[PDB]
Amino acid sequence: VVDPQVFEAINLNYPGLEKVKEFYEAGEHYYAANALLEYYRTRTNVTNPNLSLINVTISEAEQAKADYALVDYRFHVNNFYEDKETLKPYSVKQDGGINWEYSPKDASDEYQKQLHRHQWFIPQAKAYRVSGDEKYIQSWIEVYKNWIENNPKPTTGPNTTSWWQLQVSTRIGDQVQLLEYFKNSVNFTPEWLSTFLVEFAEQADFLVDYPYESGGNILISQANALATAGTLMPEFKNAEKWMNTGYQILSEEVQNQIMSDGWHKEMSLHYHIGIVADFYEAMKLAEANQLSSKLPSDFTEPLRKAAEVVMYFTYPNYFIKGSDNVVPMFNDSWSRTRNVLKNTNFKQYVEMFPDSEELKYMQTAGNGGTAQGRTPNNDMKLFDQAGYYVLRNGWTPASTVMILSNNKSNDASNSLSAYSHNQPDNGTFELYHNGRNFFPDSGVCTYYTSGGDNDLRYWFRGIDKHNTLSIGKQNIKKAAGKLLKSEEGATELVVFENQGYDNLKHRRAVFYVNKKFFVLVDEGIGNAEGTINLSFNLCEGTASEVVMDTDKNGVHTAFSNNNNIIVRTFANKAVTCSPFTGRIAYLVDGAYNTRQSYTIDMNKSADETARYITVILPVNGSTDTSSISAKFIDSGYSENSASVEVSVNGETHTLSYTL
């Protein structure tokens, strides 16, 4: 039957709804709903820049999602598969019906959260458009009806699954498209339209009622969904409220959540890219619908340095073809493809900033493309709000790029607890050199599990699974990174510190010697007593490709392509080299590969400062004859200076700084 609430939700006075209003007022609910269907079938009043219905295509992966949903309710959920090889989702079927509370045995909270995003609906819509097969719309209608009936909105605010703001906002963005994909089907009945529209208004009203209380990315996603609902479905009585609330929150949050160095406050590259996308897409949405006045004239200004962040966080192997990862994976952030960076991220940045020759180069040179524009120079790039420092000798695949992390808690990232997107990893770094990332971050592997097993979650968060200094491999308790000094020149220098523990501060100085190799001078400062661990987590390889030189307090690589490194650590006290098996996860799917790691251990007494010198030397070919030594040449630790001497292949370097 036609749900009479459709006539309460919709403004029957909206231009174009004259036949709907006439039928409704004469008590002809069916013919009114039918007129409303014809209205949606023929309207030309709105434009969604995110959807094109000219020449719709479907990928193999999307086709699998569309088809799996048709048998045993195998509903696609990102990162969760019964059989990954065949992209087979878990079945949510129980006792012949749909169990909306289903979760596989080892699953984090992300299974339930994403199941309620209905991630197979858009694939079914595309499958419908491509095939013309009505089974796809019939499935959507049947399953979405079942969802509606069995997942009532809470009356008090969000829950953590079906009615968590990010689930609701995701559904809204999909549903504005699902209407356009499916509306011409004979199975898209006036009765169905009434239910679809009533439940759409339910989603959007909910988002107005409950602005996400902890801000961050979820609030931005919510605001974008509200702008989308209000702009693209203006026929609803509450649409103006949806749109105005959305654009208002976006105008506020583009200022609130992007720091003065261009970084999103949550300090995750992934979420940074995501919030910039939400802002960009709301701007394009407003522009396409004569609503640019809903946003400030300077709306995109914070996005300029934000796009520059992405440029500096893309490694040079992005410029060639390949299937490997091309970004750092610091904090809750993971792998990213060339195609996503090239044809989504940099595509949007170029569109926003058409005069940037640097972003043009990023977009065009990506994936072995024909380069237009040009890169920045090779100067160090310091992000002193998020705490990231980027050193490089170029932008070419043959170049070297070190990114150091030294993050700093803020109002949107106030915790280092297991559920935080910020890891307790101050001082850690990655190192790209001549096509190989020699120190890729351990990554995420899994999100948090309520009441559950968080072993894997904790494992990947561990400080010693990063490349830094810790005491007793215990996670630091405070992220308050401070940049102390930077110097340009033949040898570049960055010195920074973090008071990670109340009685032990880590100061790390990195000399980029002749912009060729690295010397790290690490100091554990304070009255803490115990074992200090300087940790290193190397690139993947066979046991023969990454080889511990335990007798020499370091490691070397022996890759057949001759692109190698050798690493050696020296110290102010006796040390022990302690290999361990590390791990790296590229996706948030619970999987990982092992890789070689180690710590350099020393006993620190209360009245001592732990001091290490580490040399990281890229070598073309065999590392067998590379010769490294180092020592302190000052009298010991002091607040205001440090001085070391390093010898590499018969050349001696004196490396000193004063604050």
Swiss-Prot record:
It holds the Pfam family Hepar_II_III_N. Gene3D superfamilies: 2.70.98.70, Chondroitin AC/alginate lyase. GO terms for molecular function: heparin-sulfate lyase activity. Its EC number is 4.2.2.8. One of its GO terms (cellular component) is periplasmic space. It catalyses: Elimination of sulfate, appears to act on linkages between N-acetyl-D-glucosamine and uronate. Product is an unsaturated sugar. The active site is at 271 (proton acceptor). Its main location: periplasm. Keywords: Lyase, Periplasm, Signal. It is found in: Periplasm. Specifically cleaves heparan sulfate-rich regions of acidic polysaccharides. Does not act on N,O-desulfated glucosamine or N-acetyl-O-sulfated glucosamine linkages. Functions in cleaving metazoan heparan sulfate and providing carbon, nitrogen and sulfate sources for microorganisms. Belongs to the polysaccharide lyase 12 family. NCBIfam families: Hepsulflyase_bctds. This is Heparin-sulfate lyase. It comes from Bacteroides thetaiotaomicron (strain ATCC 29148 / DSM 2079 / JCM 5827 / CCUG 10774 / NCTC 10582 / VPI-5482 / E50). The gene is hepC.
